[PDB]
Amino acid sequence: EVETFAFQAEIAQLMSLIINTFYSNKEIFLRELISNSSDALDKIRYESLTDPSKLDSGKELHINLIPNKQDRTLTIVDTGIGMTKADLINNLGTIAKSGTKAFMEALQAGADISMIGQFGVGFYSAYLVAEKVTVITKHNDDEQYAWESSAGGSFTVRTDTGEPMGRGTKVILHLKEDQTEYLEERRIKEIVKKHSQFIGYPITLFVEK
């Protein structure tokens, strides 16, 4: 049972600007998703300090980067706090509305596009490199869900029947044809070292066949 939703007009506008604007510095998408993963890991760690049972869904706090040339996907997995269905449909878009407006106005000041992360909308930078994004997520208080969007003004949410996650978020980037450099080990390594060197969680870059 797949539910289809319209993006807010302001978010659809942000996604169109990300997709259509000429901007060569696309590698910043990985810094933003890793930063999002680190934030989600901070949240479940802090919650576990007053309720150790919050880690019954998984004690390990980590980030995995998994490229797959056969599927042309780059997957960013974290074991953070995850996302509820209300997060996917409503809450995150609500925050992203004001952040988008501030991001556009900041751009007219002296801000750079690479500062998208300071406005709570760094997630949408995934569309610098992906033609489709699939997000599998599991929050302790909700079921496992699959969010998916190829932009174009709409996204879908469904209950996920696949392998159970325990807890956390998996962002699957279905890469554009000309963006396969982000499946290369040496390229991902270079980006993590340049932009994510001091993340306080183990980042494991998986290698392929």
Ligand X SMILES: Fc1cccc(-n2ccnc2)c1
33 lies in the binding site for ligand X (CB under 6 A): no
Q: Of 21-29, 50-58, 120-128, 196-204, which segment contacts ligand X by CB under 6 A?
A: 120-128
Select the residue interacting with ligand X from 18, 28, 121, 175 (CB under 6 A).
121
Q: How far is the CB of 121 from ligand X (least distance, A)?
A: 6
Question: Distance (Å, rounded) from C-alpha 34 to C-alpha 42?
Answer: 12
123 lies in the binding site for ligand X (CB under 6 A): yes
Q: What binding mask, one character per residue, do residues 146-185 give for ligand X by CB under 6 A, x or -? A: -x--------------------------------------
Q: How many residues sit close enough to ligand X to count as binding (CB under 6 A)?
A: 8
Sites for ligand X among residues 72-91 (CB under 6 A):
88
In the complex with ligand X, the residue whose CB is nearer, 75 or 181, is: 75
List, as residue ranges, the binding site for ATP.
Answer: 36, 78, 97, 123
List interacting residues with ligand X (CB under 6 A).
88, 92, 96, 120-121, 123, 135, 147
